[PDB]
Structure 1
Amino acid sequence: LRPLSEVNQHSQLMAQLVEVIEDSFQMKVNKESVNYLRLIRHIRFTIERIKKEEPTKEPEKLMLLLKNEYPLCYNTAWKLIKILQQTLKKPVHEAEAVYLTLHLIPINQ
């Protein structure tokens, strides 16, 4: 049998993508990190979706992605939304939490 790690499906494609990221961002990736591991996992599964011509779950999985990557910004967005609901007394589309999260990420760097 062939070890899974030795099934070299798209190994050189993956390496090309990483080189593009490293050149463009002018850094070296941390192959140890959760962010890198999840990036590679995302790419591997995106390859599968592309091969099968599958769409994605546009709204809902964006939420969880941001909750996992930027929990402080994500939860802060929801705290702002809580206050908006309490004062303005209108419903809030969860897309607003996505926008707020993205606007918060740069603030404390």
Structure 2
Amino acid sequence: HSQLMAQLVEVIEDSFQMKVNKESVNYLRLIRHIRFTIERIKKEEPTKEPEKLMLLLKNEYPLCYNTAWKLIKILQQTLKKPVHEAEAVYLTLHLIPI
């Protein structure tokens, strides 16, 4: 899907008004994710909703991810209630901009 991948890349460059770093880990990862999503779509297999997101966030933003978990550690120690993993995902996403 050479022309398809090129077109997807162009939409991203136009939209974000940047040129991709084709050297970078983030880019290499994106193209691999797109190639794999193509296959899942062809096969009509479901997306993994949950624990997949966690690994992704850990790899893309280790510092925000681990920061989320230190927050959650303090919350558990204080409030004593269990913490559903989905909470580390939301916090990681709220921390990235800071």
Q: What's the TM-score once normalised by structure 2's chain length?
A: 0.99
Q: Deviations over 1:85-105 (max 9, x none)?
A: 000000000000000000000
Looking at structure 1, the residues matched to 31 and 3 of structure 2 have their Cα atoms a distance apart, in angstroms, of 13
Looking at structure 2, the residues matched to 91 and 49 of structure 1 have their Cα atoms a distance apart, in angstroms, of 34
Looking at structure 2, the residues matched to 100 and 35 of structure 1 have their Cα atoms a distance apart, in angstroms, of 21
Q: Which runs of 4+ in 1 moved over 6 A?
A: none
Q: What's the TM-score once normalised by structure 1's chain length?
A: 0.89
Structure 2 counterpart of 1:67, from 19, 42, 58:
58
Looking at structure 1, the residues matched to 35 and 97 of structure 2 have their Cα atoms a distance apart, in angstroms, of 28
Q: How much does 1:16 deviate?
A: 0.2
Q: Deviations over 1:9-63 (max 9, x none)?
A: x000000000000000000000000000000000000000000000021100000
Q: How much does 1:66 deviate?
A: 0.1
DSSP-derived class of the 2:39 partner: helix
**Structure 2: stretches of 5+ with no match in the other structure:** none
Q: Which has the higher helix share?
A: 2
What RMSD in Å do the two structures reach over aligned CA positions?
A: 0.3
Looking at structure 1, the residues matched to 42 and 50 of structure 2 have their Cα atoms a distance apart, in angstroms, of 22
Answer with 1 or 2: which has the greater Rg.
Answer: 1
Looking at structure 2, the residues matched to 64 and 100 of structure 1 have their Cα atoms a distance apart, in angstroms, of 15
DSSP-derived class of the 2:20 partner: coil
